[PDB]
């Protein structure tokens, strides 16, 4: 309720930008989780971290 996803008229929506920033962090953390699960070469994991 401090970064809401309010349903507007006609099917349209409206979010806050913190949703995009938290989505970026969750994406990069899940991908880094896989890249350290995968024993990847160190340069792409350096770039991921």
């Amino acid at each position: 309720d401090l970064r809401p996803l309010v349903p507007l008229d006609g099917g349209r929506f409206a979010t806050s930008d913190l949703n995009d920033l938290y989505r970026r962090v969750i994406n990069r953390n899940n991908r880094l989780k896989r890249l350290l699960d995968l024993a990847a070469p160190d340069i792409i994991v350096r770039n991921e971290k």
């Binding site: 507007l8 099917g11 349209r12 979010t15 930008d17 991908r31 890249l35 070469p41 340069i43």
Partner: protein, 558 residues
């Protein structure tokens, strides 16, 4: 020192233009990212770095906070970045920099590093197939899918030879090879019999999951021995100061019976009497070490050579396949430049490409002899567009449903000119064979919808969050209506006696958090829910009357 004279001139006149910084930048730095990082470095003093000649009042109105410690550490920075030229923090630029350091590969270098991968996994399979309990698990697995508990031609990839009868032929080959070796252990040709037993498995073709199961199951049976090798050395050399030449000679090389340890409780040393500290500890490791010997058909030092064949062969090929992965990083960046502006950031498209690039290498077959830049281009076409499908919109759309819009975006653009002015929605029921409703909900779906710092604007610098109203709150007219209804019931229920008001307080949830049922209220008074239903309907009819419902009838919205 020139940027120090820029600091001194800015604090000496109260402002900086773009001309003064651009005249006091050094000669070595070029592009506009680092110089406006320097503008931020001088701008949070703040000496008011703006475009033109500033006004007259707005140096006395604009303020200089906070002197001087932020300016002290900024002087520490700005007098020290006058030396190196290669400093930026952007992962895209530094990624280009640390990506150019890896050269490409030839065709011949690619296939020979591929055969380095092939002989590396061959050395891994040489270390795997040199162990018997994997093939005992292979026996019992073929036994359990002889009942077809799994699918065997999916459990293993047939064999490297399509047909279950030839899959029965090579498994009838196994159980005959297994009994001419294990039954004739009693040690001249028995290890040569395990040798012929090892040879017949390396032409069996399996699934990596049914391969990786026996690898990791002996991995926990390997580091347990490496825990045992820790269990001795953590408690001999430092616990008691037993010298490691007693560890190099007595344990290392023998490792098997109870003679390397428990005979050293009479070396007439401090550490020899100190083995009573660890005599009962490693007696648990004196059995569980030989328990592993009861689970291999060999000795512990022969297990130390088996996984060291496994580890070094894995460390060769995984480094070899990453040497192929690092080589084709220039390929992936060329692909992700074509998929860029469809929502996701540039570094995210690339890092999903190297994920498929690592997975393309694991399934690449150079025996087909095609180039690798044709195989991995399929996976990066998948994995970039899949993460564009999965992880780009704030509302996640399933992958095929994106392809429904993408086909609709590709078709309705084409019928914008092939039809005339506009394409109608009901016309799109004709072209694509979606019947006017599974085409309509495709266009109902929004697109990364709207920010709520969206400027309306020029009202009070008001944003779109200022005008969205909450409907799920409680308006204080309805709430005091609800509160006065609570007391208006309490006065109408003050007109009832002990029993009938109480059932009407526990048939509904009046000051109790149920709403008991007809039998449950009749459970309290041992009535079979019929008189309870009547005495509810008696009291309900009792509240039906005028000058009994003169306050409550007004409480209904009429």
């Amino acid at each position: 020192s020139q940027l120090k004279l820029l600091v001194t001139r800015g604090k000496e006149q109260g402002y900086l233009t773009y001309a003064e910084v651009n005249d006091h930048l050094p000669e070595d730095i070029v592009d506009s990212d680092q110089i406006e990082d320097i503008i931020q470095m001088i701008n949070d003093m703040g000496i008011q770095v703006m475009e033109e000649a500033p006004d007259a009042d707005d140096l006395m109105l604009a303020e200089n906070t906070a002197d001087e410690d932020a300016a002290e550490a900024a002087a520490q920075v700005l007098s020290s970045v006058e030396s190196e030229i290669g400093r930026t923090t952007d992962p895209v630029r530094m990624y280009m920099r640390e990506m150019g350091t890896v050269e490409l590969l030839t065709r011949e270098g690619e296939i020979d590093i591929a055969k380095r991968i092939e002989d590396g996994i061959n050395q891994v399979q040489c270390s795997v197939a040199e162990y018997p309990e994997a093939i005992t698990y292979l026996l019992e697995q073929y036994d359990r899918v002889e009942a077809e508990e799994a699918r065997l031609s999916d459990l293993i990839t047939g064999f490297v030879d399509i047909d279950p009868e030839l899959a029965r032929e090579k498994f009838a080959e196994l159980r005959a090879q297994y009994v001419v070796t294990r039954d004739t252990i009693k040690h001249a040709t028995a290890q040569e019999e395990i040798l012929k037993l090892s040879e017949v498995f390396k032409q069996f073709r399996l699934v990596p999951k049914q391969f990786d199961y026996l690898v990791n199951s002996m991995r926990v049976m390997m580091d347990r021995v490496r825990t045992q090798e820790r269990l001795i050395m953590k408690l001999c050399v430092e616990q008691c100061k037993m010298p490691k030449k007693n560890f190099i000679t007595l344990f290392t090389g023998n490792e098997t019976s109870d003679t390397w340890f428990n005979a050293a409780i009479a070396m007439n040393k401090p550490w020899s009497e100190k083995l009573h500290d660890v005599s009962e500890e490693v007696h648990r490791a004196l059995q569980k070490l030989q328990q592993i010997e009861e689970e291999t058909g060999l000795t512990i030092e022969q297990v130390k050579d088996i996984n060291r064949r496994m580890s070094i062969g894995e460390a060769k090929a995984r480094r070899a396949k990453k040497e192929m992965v690092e080589a084709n990083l220039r390929l992936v960046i060329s692909i992700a430049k074509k998929y860029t502006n469809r929502g996701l950031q540039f570094l995210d498209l690339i890092q999903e490409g190297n994920i498929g690039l690592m997975k393309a290498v694991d399934k690449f077959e150079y025996r087909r002899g095609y180039k690798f830049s044709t195989y991995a281009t399929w996976w990066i076409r998948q994995a970039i567009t899949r993460s564009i499908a999965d992880q780009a919109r704030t509302i996640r759309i399933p992958v095929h449903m994106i392809e429904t819009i993408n086909k609709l975006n590709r078709i309705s653009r084409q019928m914008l000119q092939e039809m005339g002015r506009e394409p109608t929605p009901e016309e799109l029921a004709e072209r694509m064979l979606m019947p006017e409703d599974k085409i309509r909900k495709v266009l109902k779906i929004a697109k990364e919808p709207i920010s709520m710092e969206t400027p309306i604007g020029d009202d009070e610098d008001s944003h779109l969050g200022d005008f969205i109203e909450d409907t799920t709150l409680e308006l204080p007219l309805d709430s005091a209506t609800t509160e006065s209804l609570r007391a208006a019931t309490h006065d109408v229920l003050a007109g009832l006696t002990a029993r009938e008001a109480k059932v009407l307080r526990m048939r509904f949830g009046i000051d109790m958090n149920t709403d008991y049922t007809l039998e449950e209220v009749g459970k309290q008074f041992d009535v079979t829910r019929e008189r309870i239903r009547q005495i509810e309907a008696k009291a309900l009819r009792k509240l039906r009357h005028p000058s009994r419902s003169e306050v409550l009838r007004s409480f209904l919205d009429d």
